[PDB]
Amino acid sequence: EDAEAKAKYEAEAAFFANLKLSDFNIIDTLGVGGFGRVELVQLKSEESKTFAMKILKKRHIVDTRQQEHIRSEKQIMQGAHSDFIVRLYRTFKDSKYLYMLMEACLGGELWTILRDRGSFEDSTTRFYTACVVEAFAYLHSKGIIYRDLKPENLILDHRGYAKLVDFGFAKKIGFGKKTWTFCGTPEYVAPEIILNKGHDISADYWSLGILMYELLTGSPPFSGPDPMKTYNIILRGIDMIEFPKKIAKNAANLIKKLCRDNPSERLGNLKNGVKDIQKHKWFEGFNWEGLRKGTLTPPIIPSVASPTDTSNFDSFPEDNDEPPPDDNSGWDIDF
Numbered sequence: 001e002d003a004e005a006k007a008k009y010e011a012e013a014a015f016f017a018n019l020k021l022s023d024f025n026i027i028d029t030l031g032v033g034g035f036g037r038v039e040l041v042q043l044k045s046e047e048s049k050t051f052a053m054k055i056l057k058k059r060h061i062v063d064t065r066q067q068e069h070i071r072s073e074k075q076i077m078q079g080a081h082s083d084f085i086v087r088l089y090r091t092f093k094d095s096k097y098l099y100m101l102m103e104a105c106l107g108g109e110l111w112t113i114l115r116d117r118g119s120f121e122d123s124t125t126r127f128y129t130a131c132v133v134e135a136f137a138y139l140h141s142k143g144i145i146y147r148d149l150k151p152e153n154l155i156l157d158h159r160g161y162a163k164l165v166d167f168g169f170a171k172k173i174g175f176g177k178k179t180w181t182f183c184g185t186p187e188y189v190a191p192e193i194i195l196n197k198g199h200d201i202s203a204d205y206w207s208l209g210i211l212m213y214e215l216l217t218g219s220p221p222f223s224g225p226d227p228m229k230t231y232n233i234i235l236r237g238i239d240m241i242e243f244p245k246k247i248a249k250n251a252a253n254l255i256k257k258l259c260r261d262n263p264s265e266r267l268g269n270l271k272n273g274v275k276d277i278q279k280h281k282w283f284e285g286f287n288w289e290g291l292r293k294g295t296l297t298p299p300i301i302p303s304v305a306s307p308t309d310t311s312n313f314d315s316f317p318e319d320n321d322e323p324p325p326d327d328n329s330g331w332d333i334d335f
């Protein structure tokens, strides 16, 4: 890419290769999940430098058969250099835990901001969707499906730019091949996943349409009391849903083109690929070059006092549970 950008990536690589776990102190929690959590950590030698550290329990990964998913998360996320994807700088490992040292984005999870605001305006949603589109353009060009798009997986940096996190379901898929794991939130799964027909990158465009709908109204378009009713609603299709009047004509047209039943008919999957999404009328006048250059003013400007401020995140219970058993199976050799 840019020669200066490349030299910076190489220097960064050399800098993190020198680091050890004992160089860091823990500041606070940014998130929690099934078998781990994300902590804000601070470098002892430079108080200005804070990071996000995902800490996962190895035995639980083994018990849930998530080994290849986590390996893929490291590979995909560590090799990605996109301004719209949180960086994974490196990993650590011991007998009990895996440790993923990531770029810190202190503006908050989009899900909590959506919750507190109820819904996002058209122009606000367009900015966040464009951030996803750019992340998708980068991933899809390298044959990588992401599969976990939803508001909890978009983080804002201190400027208000949005970035993808949580690549545990992201996967490299070959030309003309399909993958078969049933993963993801019931509200976001494409019909080809529900029907166990195999899915490919086209499932990501489906999920983009779901995201637009949820950001604009506060809720995904297909939702039922239980997962089974939700799946049937999804099978009925996006044309059977009565779009609220708050969704602008152009947004609704783009949502329905993203959420085509046939994966081959979905926008982003046609002749011009992702360009067909970016050139859609809903993005008319949107300055993509300024988005990529960081010139554009985000819709919501977060307040971040310092590199240790976690005020834009919910409170999270401390994990004071007895440590998990040692895992020496060795699937984590590369970590």
Ligand SMILES: CCCOc1ccc(OC)c(F)c1C(=O)c1ccc(C(=O)N[C@@H]2CNC[C@H]2NC(=O)c2ccc3[nH]ncc3c2)cc1
Binding pocket: 030, 031, 032, 033, 034, 035, 036, 037, 038, 051, 052, 054, 056, 064, 066, 069, 070, 086, 102, 103, 104, 105, 106, 152, 153, 155, 165, 166, 168, 169
């Ligand atoms: C029994 C089923 C288990 O569920 C899984 C199923 C599969 C799997 O992998 C295949 C799993 F790991 C799991 C997990 O156990 C799991 C453990 C923790 C988390 C988690 O904390 N998520 C955060 C909260 N919400 C978004 C995330 N935020 C960041 O990640 C982040 C990253 C960098 C950042 N920089 N700045 C801010 C910032 C934020 C998620 C899932």
